[PDB]
Amino acid sequence: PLRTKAVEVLQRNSRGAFTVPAHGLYPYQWLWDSAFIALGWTQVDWERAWQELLCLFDYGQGPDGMLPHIVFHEQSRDYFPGPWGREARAQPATSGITQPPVVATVVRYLYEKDPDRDRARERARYLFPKLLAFHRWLYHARDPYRTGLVVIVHPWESGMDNSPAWDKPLSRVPVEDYDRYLSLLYLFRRLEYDPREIYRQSPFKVVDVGFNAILQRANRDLYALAVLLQEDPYEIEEWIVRGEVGLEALWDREAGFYFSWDLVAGEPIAVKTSAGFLPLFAGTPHQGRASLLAQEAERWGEKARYLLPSVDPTSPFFEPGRYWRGPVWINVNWMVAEGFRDYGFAALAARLKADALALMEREGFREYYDPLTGQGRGGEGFSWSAALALFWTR
Amino acid sequence: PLRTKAVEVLQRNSRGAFTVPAHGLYPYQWLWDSAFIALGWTQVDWERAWQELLCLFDYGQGPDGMLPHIVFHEQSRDYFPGPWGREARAQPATSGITQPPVVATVVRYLYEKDPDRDRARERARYLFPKLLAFHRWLYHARDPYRTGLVVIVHPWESGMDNSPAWDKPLSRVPVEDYDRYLSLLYLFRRLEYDPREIYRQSPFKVVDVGFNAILQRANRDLYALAVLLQEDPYEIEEWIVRGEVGLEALWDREAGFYFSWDLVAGEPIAVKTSAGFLPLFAGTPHQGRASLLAQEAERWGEKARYLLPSVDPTSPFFEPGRYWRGPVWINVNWMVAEGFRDYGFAALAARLKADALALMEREGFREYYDPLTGQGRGGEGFSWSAALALFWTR
Amino acid sequence: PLRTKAVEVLQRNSRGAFTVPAHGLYPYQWLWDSAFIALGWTQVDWERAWQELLCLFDYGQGPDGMLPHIVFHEQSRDYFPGPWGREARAQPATSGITQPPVVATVVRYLYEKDPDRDRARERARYLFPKLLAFHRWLYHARDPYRTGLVVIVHPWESGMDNSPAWDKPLSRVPVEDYDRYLSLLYLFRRLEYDPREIYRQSPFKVVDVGFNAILQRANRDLYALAVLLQEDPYEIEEWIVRGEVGLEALWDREAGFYFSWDLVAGEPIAVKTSAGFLPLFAGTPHQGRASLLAQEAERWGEKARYLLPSVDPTSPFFEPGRYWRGPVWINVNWMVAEGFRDYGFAALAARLKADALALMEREGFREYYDPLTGQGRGGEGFSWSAALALFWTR
Ligand SMILES: OC[C@H]1O[C@H](O)[C@H](O)[C@@H](O)[C@@H]1O
Ligand SMILES: OC[C@H]1O[C@H](O)[C@H](O)[C@@H](O)[C@@H]1O
Ligand SMILES: OC[C@H]1O[C@H](O)[C@H](O)[C@@H](O)[C@@H]1O
Numbered sequence A, B, C: 001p002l003r004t005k006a007v008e009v010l011q012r013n014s015r016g017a018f019t020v021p022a023h024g025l026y027p028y029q030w031l032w033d034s035a036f037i038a039l040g041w042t043q044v045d046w047e048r049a050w051q052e053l054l055c056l057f058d059y060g061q062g063p064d065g066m067l068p069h070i071v072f073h074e075q076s077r078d079y080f081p082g083p084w085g086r087e088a089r090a091q092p093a094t095s096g097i098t099q100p101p102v103v104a105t106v107v108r109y110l111y112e113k114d115p116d117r118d119r120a121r122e123r124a125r126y127l128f129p130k131l132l133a134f135h136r137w138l139y140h141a142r143d144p145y146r147t148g149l150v151v152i153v154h155p156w157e158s159g160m161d162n163s164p165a166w167d168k169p170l171s172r173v174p175v176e177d178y179d180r181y182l183s184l185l186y187l188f189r190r191l192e193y194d195p196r197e198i199y200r201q202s203p204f205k206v207v208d209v210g211f212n213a214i215l216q217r218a219n220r221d222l223y224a225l226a227v228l229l230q231e232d233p234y235e236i237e238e239w240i241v242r243g244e245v246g247l248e249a250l251w252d253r254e255a256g257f258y259f260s261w262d263l264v265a266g267e268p269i270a271v272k273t274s275a276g277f278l279p280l281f282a283g284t285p286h287q288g289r290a291s292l293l294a295q296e297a298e299r300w301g302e303k304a305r306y307l308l309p310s311v312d313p314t315s316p317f318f319e320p321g322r323y324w325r326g327p328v329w330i331n332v333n334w335m336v337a338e339g340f341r342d343y344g345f346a347a348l349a350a351r352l353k354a355d356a357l358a359l360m361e362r363e364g365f366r367e368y369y370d371p372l373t374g375q376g377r378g379g380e381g382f383s384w385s386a387a388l389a390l391f392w393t394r
């Protein structure tokens, strides 16, 4: 059954203190995957859940606070030995781009719910300044004008690599898509990874509604952690107040949806994707706006057997089997269901959960699912699917 | 039919680059009229739509950023010749008071929807600092204590000249109404139009819920324009955060409505007018509050054939034919319908539109309408009625 | 009948310019009682209503702005003689702890509704800086890190002395409950009432959702008073913006309720009390969240004859007759009904009122009521019950 088999997936993908995202992969750790995965481990071993994230920060984070989307461990890792600072160690290679910052929301959960309160305090106090340094890096590097919104400089940073929202922005990248993904990374290295220059010169510069909604939720949860731990919340309050203005600005009244914005073109990207629901998870809309989203989600359910497709099924870009261009994803079902529940849309949240769980019962733990047939696609033994099966049924 | 005849009205009232508010009038340009009118021109000629507003700013705006409610052109105007700065030109007389600042909301629309993206960028980048200087003037002159709310010092500044809300405040103006309107203007000139002295000494000093709701919506839209154009949003964020506190303060829980405030008396003005619905257009209430407004609007619909009367039909001040003391206005129907739609009140928004359109089909394009009989009143070939007929049916 | 008998209670408990909370008590004045009581006096004598609060501030408030929960008058007081500063007078003993700051909300009501506008202005201008100094003391003493949330250092400060929420926090206080209440006060005196040391060292340190919701409502109302009186709102705006973030942080999504937080343990206190409804009175939730509260209140109504019990009737701590551990309280019914009404929950607000009024018709004016039988309990001729009977039926 679901939970036992989900544990088996997590154990098979474990490399000591981190979990690979899927069967077959090299021993590398991914940023947002590890955050969702840690939620899974809470249903198995609380220390192991904490260790997932200690490992991400301990081996991943730079002196400027940046958290990379991949840590290239190339080996298994032991648990954090504690204050670490008194022996020499190896620092692995990492990527030079980031991913959606759901981590603070996870750490708040682990802190609040760990039945071992001494451990909870020790781990949260250790992680708190590291989280704070990561949010700080995001704002300082990616919102240097203090707009309240951060930019992504590479489509991979959205976590939604080939979202049809990125098609037009990607098309302007001078050197079919892989060539443009690689050209961006070549530009960043050519610019010595200088945040000021790359923000100035990147030919891809997008305010991603997903990344921002996730960051705003995380800001709220980081604030709560700061108050509970009696840490100073000064910087976090600023991000919250600006971010509330920023995220709501992305609502397009004529479309009745939230859009990502293309700052190179200076235009909203008029493509409705599952990311546009994520401000519900941030908690920024008013109820009328949430109700218009609920109506939209139900309309998508008129054309797809399983919610929530990654793009509007009536979009000319909708393709039922192609990664972020139509298929259902377990992590996004979970965030969006959480958001709908928060706004009182209990039946719609329940449907999102029931569809996620049915897909995993039928097909096992896969990366994404065809919304028309329910066919499992992509990676096998896909860790965040397994982890969220465990968490959602706790 | 409606749209062709609406175009004819706009063309007949055109004076090159600006549009007079109605048939028969001198070649003068009005501030809020021109903003609504520009929306109309989008259905005819996008450049002409932009030119309406370029003309308002180019001939209207002072070195301190102030936009006057009237620019006394006394002649037709040519399109903006571009960087203008290298030849001498004439600067017309203007009024010394302002009007509701809906302009930034219009400019955002023109920017986002112009099919010519090069033109959109050129025009919006040109107008952005001018808009910003106007909002700045409003706050610095009319909210010197940084409350988040601006005062009007003359009833005309509300755009709702004889609203029954102004009766008591107007009655204290030392020298029947025209005498008091003129005395205010004499005071302002006597004080050399010094904003600091006039704020201190004006015997008429009102926080108008309409003006403020319109300004708050415009602040939100100016923020979006700043982010899209990669302009610095620093000042605008301050106005938004303070303005959200300010506008919501105007809600009176016992009345279940938003009231303008009389700062000379230090009291809410307990008169329910159509302006009290406008915080929906600003997007500040929560849904419960929006629902109480929807209930009120429906209650007004029990006594008036056509929504939305400018005053509660059960008010002792309600008069079905007298300007802002009862009659229906197309611009306010439009803003309020927009607001209700945003809060999910689709049927009520639809009714507001259907009533506005029926009145214009039956009576043509008039300034205001009797809510009991539907009789057209006031100006003929009334431009914002024609313009919003075009915009609302786009 | 209710109103005449309520007046009789207030008159019998009057000691000149202040009202004792109940029949039989020494001539002492209580902070939150006097605020609710002043609302009662508006239905009898407006000057007497103002005098209640003038007396509280004039004899109660320190040079640092602190308002104590008890002023130990030991005698009756004459009305405020006006600018007071030119003769010597007696300054009574006061307690060294505070109570929920509902006062600014009351003063706003008295200001707006006094039919004597000259008196209203004189009294409100006199009280405004004193209110402002009290809110300032609260934030500076009890939120020295500028979180937006204040702590209580003694359970009595919540006004909900034996709320089951305080059980675990109280249990850590080194020296059955009275011994721990007294030990806290001994600590404070040992620390010379130094706010910095007591915040640092108190073994009881709780973010009370009730106190904070009441303070946030009061901040909003103090802002409105500042704007109406043309006072400077600078400090108040800061408290409002931070407080909106703080109060919403207390929502627990898994429980669907607002919890107080224990800052010594660093944990939410997972006990659902009537205080958790009070953010409705502050106006901070969105409607979805208000709807989840309405659902919870209705669920409590499935097990209790009378709403609103002070603790969830299904709580293991629920006891129908024991002070704040189950019984119905008139003041909390009133605040929560006010809040529900604001969010459009008209039937639920009406039920709260109908239950409060039925209990007082049947049992007279008592401190609290058994939610299962309706039996009156605690003090007799309980002033805030009488006062809110008068106010709620005005
Ligand atoms: O599984 C690791 C990564 O694989 C793919 O790139 C997914 O689109 C991305 O969201 C995920 O984080
Ligand atoms: O048409 C120009 C002006 O005419 C009247 O004064 C209207 O009340 C005002 O709103 C409008 O802007
Ligand atoms: O009546 C005076 C006081 O008595 C009790 O301590 C109540 O619990 C408290 O809320 C009240 O303020």
Ligand SMILES: [Cl-]
Pocket (backbone or CB within 6 Å): A285, A286, A287, A288, B285, B286, B287, B288, C285, C286, C287, C288
């Ligand atoms: Cl809401």
